[PDB]
Design a protein around this nucleic acid. Structure first.
Ligand SMILES: [Zn+2]
Lengths: 136, 94, 141, 131, 130, 38
RNA sequence: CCAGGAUGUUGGCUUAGAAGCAGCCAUCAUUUAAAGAAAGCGUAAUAGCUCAGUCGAGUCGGCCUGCGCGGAAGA
């Protein structure tokens, strides 16, 4: 999966996800999957979403991952009293703001593009929209 | 080439800008040369279809405001956070 | 010139007179005899030359025998002894493989006097030069 | 689909230019016929396998209109097929006549031999003309 | 082990041995090594099959043979019936006898003769080793 | 037929009809394409 | 809606056999109003289905958005 090979810190606070997103336009490929809803994508959701599109396109073209977890999440198991120290990291998520270019694709037709991202978007928790590279 | 009917704005600020986006309109500005900037309010739909063409960002544009054709050029454009709409476009006198 | 009324077509060559391994009882199970394919068939086949896969209609009514009129064979049979090699293409288009030409297959597809549309000896002539290049072969026309 | 304006102007413009030089243009009904029959009719008229083509009453109406022609609307009723001759004697009426091998005539609505209109009762008159 | 040509090209004898017993054994190990070294493969018996099945169950017998991974050679017409010729692994003939009589109420019958040995099908080549 | 919230047109002979207030998928080439609860 | 929906050619290689309809390629030409070296089903290979002149003015489906539908089964 996708996760920081090294971090200056192991744990991190809650961190609220407010405001819009930065990456809204595609600057690597001709197409790509854009986000519309609000939430967070885990390493599993991202990886699983990659396999879908990457599989729907056989072994041609190229895909990019504009997003990245880089955010540890701690959780406490069952039969555990509150407190007693912060929980332990179980997985890493990535804050996705409305307009975050999730993935991108290039080297394949426009029709095959939607189909690819269509099977990948179904893996994503939040809604998404298909976008095409625009000039300026 | 691309004729874009425009009208000088009567009030600036995000407050007025928002009221424009709630009526199929969006804020704009034409700067450049020795002339002073001019607030402009272009139609959403109209410009929404004109920007769809790559020739809109390449070829020169002709904005008609108060009976005046100013040959400008698309400098920059701000698109909606996630919807296929426009927020503001900057034009340069050329 | 009328409608559907039996008209199969399965052969391997003009030499094999009523074969068995390739087809056999397959050329006669509805109204054709797996024996008379030498009487009416070679009624004039051995009078010319046997070596070109020539198919033929059937046309059966109910009068035992059949009145099938043999006609011009495929133009592909002319790509093994009239165009060049008999086979072996190696690679489809990754290589130009072989190559025909103008003069080639020119007076070879002209002999046809029972097929081809339009007598224009220029439009119906080049009509038998497309496939000769469709198999990766080059055009020396 | 359909044909664009500019793409339709040529179609009619062509059938019209060929009607100004056509020495003949017989009209008849060809419904229930097969390709083997159509081809046979084409092979008889010209070894080129090109002869007798089906066209709408409109494409023909404005084609026969684009050219100084009158009194032919009656020949354009429902299924219509034209047969013109740009070269050689337009006496090729015997070919189709014998092809239809019909004891009647109706099918061969009308025609225009050498700029001269002719009904259906005259299709036989020309089909019986000596060499 | 069958269908193989063995050649001898070099050797030698030594200080005490050199006996019919010595070289008899010397030949054993040489063969075992070679057979395992020259890409081994199975050889199953292929049978020539002639299936008479009405004139109406003919097309049904063909399709059944095609599924049995057989290879049709051509069908002969006999009376108001048909005789289908084809090759099929005695291995895979497995139950054709009855599967054929089932789709014909017994109408059909068939004869089976040995024809030749051919190289097995990868999938089956793995199940043999044990 | 197979009932499930999701209903689509598999083959080209599919038809999305509404009866009484429930989306259905009628077919005339494959009984398996019959759906319900759309 | 009633129609037509062809010809070179079963295109060439491969194959038991592939002919639009396993699969590699190739995808020109043709008589035309139009017909792809072929959409889906179907054949063991064929066959057989079949999608892409009349009638006389309306028809086709993407975008943004309002209001609804199914998704929704507890004592
Ligand atoms: Zn269905």
């Amino acid at each position: 999966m996708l996760q920081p090979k090294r971090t200056k810190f192991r744990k991190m606070h809650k961190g609220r996800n407010r405001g819009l997103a930065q990456g809204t336009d595609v600057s690597f490929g001709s197409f790509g999957l854009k986000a519309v809803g609000r939430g967070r994508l885990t390493a599993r959701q991202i990886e699983a979403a990659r396999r879908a599109m990457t599989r729907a396109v056989k072994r041609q073209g190229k895909i990019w991952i504009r997003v990245f977890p880089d955010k540890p999440i701690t959780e406490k198991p069952l039969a555990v009293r509150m407190g007693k120290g912060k929980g332990n990291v179980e997985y890493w998520v990535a804050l996705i703001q409305p307009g975050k270019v999730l993935y991108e694709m290039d080297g394949v037709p426009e029709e095959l593009a939607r189909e690819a991202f269509k099977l990948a978007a179904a893996k994503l928790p939040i809604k998404t929209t298909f976008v095409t590279k625009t000039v300026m | 080439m691309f004729t874009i009917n425009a009208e000088v704005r009567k009030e600036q600020g995000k407050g007025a800008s928002r009221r424009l986006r709630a009526a199929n309109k969006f804020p704009a500005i034409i700067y450049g040369g020795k002339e002073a900037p001019l607030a402009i309010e272009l139609d959403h739909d109209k410009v929404m279809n004109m920007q769809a063409k790559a020739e809109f960002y390449s070829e020169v544009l002709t904005i008609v405001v108060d009976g005046k054709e100013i040959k400008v050029k698309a400098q920059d454009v701000q698109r909606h956070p996630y919807k296929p709409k426009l927020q503001h476009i900057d034009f340069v006198r050329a | 010139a009328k409608k559907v009324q039996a008209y199969v077509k399965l052969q391997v060559a003009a030499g094999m007179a009523n074969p068995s391994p390739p087809v056999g009882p397959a050329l006669g199970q509805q109204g054709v005899n797996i024996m008379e394919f030498c009487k009416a068939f070679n009624a004039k086949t051995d009078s010319i030359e046997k070596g070109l896969p020539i198919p033929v209609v059937i046309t059966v009514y109910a009068d035992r025998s059949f009145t099938f009129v043999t006609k011009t064979p495929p133009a592909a049979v002319l790509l093994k002894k009239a165009a060049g090699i008999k086979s072996g293409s190696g690679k489809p288009n990754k290589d130009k493989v072989g190559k025909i030409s103008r003069a080639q297959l020119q007076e070879i597809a002209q002999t046809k006097a029972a097929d081809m549309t339009g007598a224009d000896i220029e439009a119906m002539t080049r009509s038998i030069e497309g496939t000769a290049r469709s198999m990766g072969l080059v055009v020396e026309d | 689909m359909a044909l664009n304006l500019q793409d339709k102007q040529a179609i009619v413009a062509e059938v019209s230019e060929v009607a100004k030089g056509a020495l003949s243009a017989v009209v008849a009904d060809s419904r229930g016929v097969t390709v083997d029959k159509m081809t046979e009719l084409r092979k008889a008229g010209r070894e080129a396998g090109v002869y007798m083509r089906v066209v709408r009453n409109t494409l023909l109406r404005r084609a026969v209109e684009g050219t100084p022609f009158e009194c032919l609307k009656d020949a354009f009723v429902g299924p219509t097929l034209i047969a013109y001759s740009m070269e050689h004697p337009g006496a090729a009426a015997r070919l189709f006549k014998e092809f239809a091998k019909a004891n009647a005539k109706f099918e061969v609505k009308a025609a225009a031999f050498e700029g001269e209109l002719i009904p259906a009762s005259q299709i036989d008159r020309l089909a019986t003309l000596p060499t | 082990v069958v269908d193989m040509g063995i050649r001898l090209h070099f050797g030698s004898y030594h200080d005490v041995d050199s006996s019919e017993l010595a070289f008899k054994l010397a030949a054993s190990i040489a063969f075992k090594e070679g057979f395992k070294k020259a890409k081994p493969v199975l050889l199953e018996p292929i049978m020539k099959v002639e299936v008479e099945t009405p004139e109406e169950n003919t097309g049904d017998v063909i399709g059944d043979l095609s599924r049995r991974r057989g290879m049709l050679k051509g069908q002969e017409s006999e009376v108001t019936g048909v005789k289908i010729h084809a090759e099929v692994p005695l291995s895979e003939m497995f139950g054709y006898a009855t599967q054929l009589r089932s789709l014909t109420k017994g109408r059909a019958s068939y004869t089976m003769e040995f024809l030749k040995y051919d190289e097995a099908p990868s999938n089956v080549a793995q199940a043999v080793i044990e | 037929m197979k009932v499930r919230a999701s209903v689509k047109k598999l083959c080209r002979n599919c038809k999305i009809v509404k009866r009484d207030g429930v989306i259905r998928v009628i077919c005339s080439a494959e009984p398996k394409h019959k759906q319900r609860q759309g």
